[PDB]
Structures are given as C-alpha cells and as structure tokens.
C-alpha cells in the first residue's frame, strides 16, 4: 500500500520527514487554531532541550508547534517544527496550550532500508520536487517512531536512483 505524501525535509535517505495526505486536514486545523490564538499566547521562557512550545518560523514570521533542540546564545534556540520536519533558529517562543499539545506530530520522520541502499544526486532530485506528491510504503515503525519505508515518485521507487 502506498500513501500520498509531501517530502518536506530531507537530510538523506536515512533521515527525512514527510506529511501524509491524510494528516493534512488536522494540520490545517492546527494552523487555524494557532493563528487564531497566536497573539494572546503568553511568552514561553523555559528554554531547555526537549521542551514543547510554539516557535516562530523565520520565513513565515508564523508560530508553529515546536520542540527545542539546543540552547544557543542570547535567547536563540535551535527548534524543530514537529508538524513539518524542518529546523530553525529563532528567539520568539510562546506557550503551547495543552489541548493543542495532545495531538500527535503531523510530520513523520523516515528512512529507507540501508540494507538496500549503497548522495547529492537524490538530494537535489527530491528538493526539486518539494511541491510534488510522493508515496511511501511504511515497512515498519522503528522503536523511536522513525518509519522505515520505500520512497516512490509517480511509481518509480526512487531507489532506482541509488548506486
């Protein structure tokens, strides 16, 4: 079975996040709810590795559910946007209502079986299609939540592109 998705982040065949076409509705709501309340959210100042909050995405100037990854200098923190998959450095953090923290992350961490692969060529191939639909076959869900899959692009297991 193949699931429609959008590869939003891609650091390699071992580490890349995607968004399932089915979590799109919920994510769309998360966005409305976080935009409808963005301005009234109190400042979140407990910056510690792992903490959940709502951080501002430099490109958008928009706040998204995020998880702090590292504490840098002068308020700056490397955050991870759980519903997307990309990272960023920002200084703008706000509290995350517990009702809007209950939902699961809407982007899924993935990887292809290293056992079947042996890279800058595929990287550009994926990024050149950031705005296009792919397909995943979830072969398993690793113990840490990371999916092990096979990536398709209009029916070509992109694995054909790996030597």
């Amino acid at each position: 079975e193949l699931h429609n998705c959008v590869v939003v982040q891609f650091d390699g065949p071992m580490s890349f996040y995607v968004q399932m076409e089915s979590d799109v509705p919920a994510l769309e709501q998360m966005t409305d709810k976080l935009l409808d309340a963005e301005q009234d959210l109190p400042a979140f100042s407990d910056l510690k590795e792992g903490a959940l909050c709502v951080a501002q995405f430099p490109e958008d100037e928009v706040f998204y559910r995020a998880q702090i990854r590292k504490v840098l200098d002068d308020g700056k923190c490397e955050v991870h946007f759980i519903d997307f998959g990309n990272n960023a450095v920002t200084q703008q953090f706000r509290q995350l209502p517990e009702e809007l923290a209950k939902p699961a992350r809407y982007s899924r961490h993935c990887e292809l079986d290293a056992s079947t692969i042996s890279a800058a060529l595929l990287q550009s191939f994926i990024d050149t299609r950031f705005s296009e639909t792919f397909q995943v076959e979830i072969l398993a869900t690793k113990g840490t939540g990371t999916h092990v899959v096979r990536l398709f692009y209009q029916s070509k297991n992109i694995s054909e592109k790996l030597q």
Binding site: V8, Q19, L27, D32, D60, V62, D83, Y106, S107
Partner: peptide, 7 residues
C-alpha cells in the same frame, strides 16, 4: 514548503 503553512 509543506502544508498548513498558513500565509
């Protein structure tokens, strides 16, 4: 990119 970016 992605979805539900909002802007």
């Amino acid at each position: 990119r992605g979805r539900g970016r909002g802007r």
